[PDB]
Amino acid sequence: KLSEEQQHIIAILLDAHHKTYDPTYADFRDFRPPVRMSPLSMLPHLADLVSYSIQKVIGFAKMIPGFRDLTSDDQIVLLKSSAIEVIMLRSNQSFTMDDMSWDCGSQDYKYDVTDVSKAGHTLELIEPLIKFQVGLKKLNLHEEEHVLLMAICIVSPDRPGVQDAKLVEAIQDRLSNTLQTYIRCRHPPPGSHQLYAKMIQKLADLRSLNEEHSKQYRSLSFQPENSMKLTPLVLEVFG
Amino acid sequence: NHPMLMNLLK
Numbered sequence: 001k002l003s004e005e006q007q008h009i010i011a012i013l014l015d016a017h018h019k020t021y022d023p024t025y026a027d028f029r030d031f032r033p034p035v036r037m038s039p040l041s042m043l044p045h046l047a048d049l050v051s052y053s054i055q056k057v058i059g060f061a062k063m064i065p066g067f068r069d070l071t072s073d074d075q076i077v078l079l080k081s082s083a084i085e086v087i088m089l090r091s092n093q094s095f096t097m098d099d100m101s102w103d104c105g106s107q108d109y110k111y112d113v114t115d116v117s118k119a120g121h122t123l124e125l126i127e128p129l130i131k132f133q134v135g136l137k138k139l140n141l142h143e144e145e146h147v148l149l150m151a152i153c154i155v156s157p158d159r160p161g162v163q164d165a166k167l168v169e170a171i172q173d174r175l176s177n178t179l180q181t182y183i184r185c186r187h188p189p190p191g192s193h194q195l196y197a198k199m200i201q202k203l204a205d206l207r208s209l210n211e212e213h214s215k216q217y218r219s220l221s222f223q224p225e226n227s228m229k230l231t232p233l234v235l236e237v238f239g
Numbered sequence: 240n241h242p243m244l245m246n247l248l249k
């Protein structure tokens with residue numbers, strides 16, 4: 001059965017996500033304006049959206065049950081390494097198969113392959129990023145599953161620099177078991193079929209997306225003019 | 240070594 005502690009965990013994660021994810025996208029007006037015309041034209045706007053999305057991910061992270069028992073150093077390690085992955089995951093909510101784009105409520109705030117390309121990132125990242133978004137959209141997760149996946153991604157014990165791995169594992173296991181059990185009791189077939197394993201596979205796809213993101217981040221960063229257009233939080237978190 | 244991330248995590 002799904003236990004009251006597990007039902008509690010889901011409750012917390014749903015509310016945590018509701019408080020950190022605004023489906024109206026009202027704050028996007030604070031970002032430097034988008035420019036689609038112009039090389040690296042989209043960079044200030046998307047750097048700002050990523051920066052924001054980093055803060056919101058931290059807000060979600062803090063509210064994950066057991067995350068607060070970790071050492072600050074370990075909180076930091078886990079956020080640093082997962083941030084881009086959770087941003088990719090949470091972005092599925094605005095991603096639409098209708099036209100393969102992230103639709104954030106208005107054409108100024110709707111982003112596509114060419115827009116990401118105008119942010120300095122190549123198809124090496126973008127082609128497999130979009131694949132990832134289609135494959136995840138196809139899962140048609142319950143919101144409950146969505147929030148658990150993001151949390152399990154954040155609390156991973158194998159991230160490099162992790163001190164108290166045993167404790168990190170104990171937190172993630174609690175979330176993993178919560179997710180397995182939820183799918184069995186709440187997810188009707190055939191949607192539930194191999195759904196856990198398919199979700200876990202997505203965590204592996206994200207590692208590879210993360211690896212590629214890092215290489216391209218490092219390349220773009222070597223030039224200091226690009227780095228100038230990023231935010232301080234983005235420089236601190238991405239390196 | 241992460242002043243801002245630390246502040247937002249606190």
Ligand SMILES: C=C1[C@H](O)CC(=C/C=C2\CCC[C@]3(C)[C@@H]([C@H](C)CCCC(=O)c4ccc(O)cc4)CC[C@@H]23)C[C@H]1O
Pocket residue numbers: 043046047049050053087088090091092093094095102104111116119120121217220221226227230
């Ligand atoms: C609120 C949300 C999510 O948090 C974020 C959303 C979309 C995220 C997207 C869709 C559009 C493109 C996004 C932002 C990806 C970009 C590759 C990020 C590009 C900007 C960027 O991070 C960068 C640029 C230059 C540089 O030297 C270092 C970094 C990373 C994740 C991609 C929409 C919306 O659903």
